[PDB]
Structure of Transthyretin:
Amino acid sequence: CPLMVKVLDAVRGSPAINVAVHVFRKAADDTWEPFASGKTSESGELHGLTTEEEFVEGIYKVEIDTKSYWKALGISPFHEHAEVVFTANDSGPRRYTIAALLSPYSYSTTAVVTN
Amino acid sequence: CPLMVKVLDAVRGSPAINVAVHVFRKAADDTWEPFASGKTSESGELHGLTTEEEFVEGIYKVEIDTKSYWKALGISPFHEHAEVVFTANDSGPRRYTIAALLSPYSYSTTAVVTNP
Amino acid sequence: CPLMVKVLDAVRGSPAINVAVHVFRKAADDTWEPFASGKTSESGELHGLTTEEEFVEGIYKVEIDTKSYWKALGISPFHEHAEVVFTANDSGPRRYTIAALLSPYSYSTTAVVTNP
Amino acid sequence: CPLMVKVLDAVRGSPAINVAVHVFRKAADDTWEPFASGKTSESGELHGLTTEEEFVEGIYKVEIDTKSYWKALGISPFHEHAEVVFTANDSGPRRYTIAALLSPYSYSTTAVVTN
Ligand SMILES: O=C(O)CO/N=C(/c1ccccc1)c1ccc(Cl)c(Cl)c1
Ligand SMILES: O=C(O)CO/N=C(\c1ccccc1)c1ccc(Cl)c(Cl)c1
């Protein structure tokens, strides 16, 4: 699995469950084409988005539906969503984990790239 | 000043200076229209982007060009840019500070919203 | 002002007001001695803790009483407090801003260090 | 395993490996008594610190030796260490994960409490 997403909730100190996640790849058209999508699991994780074959070098966007998550909790959030845009590179390590820590008025994101 | 951007560098412990920022507003046809742009100062701040009259309700996107920033320091970073998307002035006018704390493989963004 | 503390609330998108802050300096016997203390203002800032003369080289600890803060908002948080420990003025005097961004189960702290 | 620590490096986008971690429990003496310690693994994780029997309600301090980590990388860091102080509570969920994301002049920490 070369791309995994992990979403955490900083208010409840828990994994962010059932969060919609959409992945896009930039096309020569210069527009974002849908690539993969999922809802996070009970552990806040989303796996099996793509394969090694499919995940070629390019610019990818990971879009996390944070607003719907906070709305579900009855908490008024600042952001429409959290979007992480990055370039996938062959020179780098094989596996990418995109992590997001969510708060109603803030988020943090990090990438953990490993072999 | 209803919209201010502050960018900090978590590697150097400093303001992130001369960072390009672009602000977009969602149009009637759903396209992102250019709204305002600038560079952060020596204090990592960008002020004077808009006015109270111009800054109407809407969905706005603040794009911070972090990749150029890191590249000028010799660092090849993970992210193309940091993007902050939010609905503004939904419940009347407010003043917004969008802050970003940058590292090569990570970034944090928070909003401070105050009532005029 | 060589040492300033800024505290923000990531739930409300606001300054974190009236937060108690205690600053300690490591003594000759390795004990933490009280150095300065105060509460954040309506802007989430605490200034006037020390002077250039008083703020000598040393290891300092900035303790932010986040648990009292959250409890007054009805929230039972994870952390007792946020503690920031650092060596200051090691290479000559500097101005330090210690910033903390608070959530009930998480906190982020960054330093902005500038040369007088 | 009721207490795990996970340490990530925001500069290299990788797990923070071989980082010293010390856990303390507050004593009636009002002083920190050593409880457990370890070095993070190649995945940035430290497990098997304690048992369910041993990990009673109380105030605990997790102290991460961030300065030595950055020194090893030749990067000048701001903090002496990262310390996370919290109260363990029976009413809450059984498992605690203390995570830290490190930068030379900043860190973030979060707790993920689950059953
Ligand atoms: O709205 C604001 O005031 C700007 O936000 N500022 C800061 C900050 C502020 C001053 C000094 C250092 C960081 C900030 C932002 C983000 C984070 Cl994650 C942290 Cl620990 C601090
Ligand atoms: O595990 C991974 O590969 C990615 O995890 N990243 C985590 C994290 C990890 C475990 C538990 C809690 C947070 C994370 C992310 C962002 C932040 Cl700001 C923090 Cl303090 C932790």
Summary: The pocket of L57 (ligand 2) is lined by residues A 6, 8, 97, 99, 101, 108, 110, 112; D 6, 8, 97, 99-101, 108-110, 112 (CB under 6 Å). Residues 23 and 62 of chain D are 5 Å apart (CA to CA). Chain D touches chain A through twelve residues (CB under 8 Å). The domain at 1-115 of chain D is CATH 2.60.40.180 (Immunoglobulin-like).
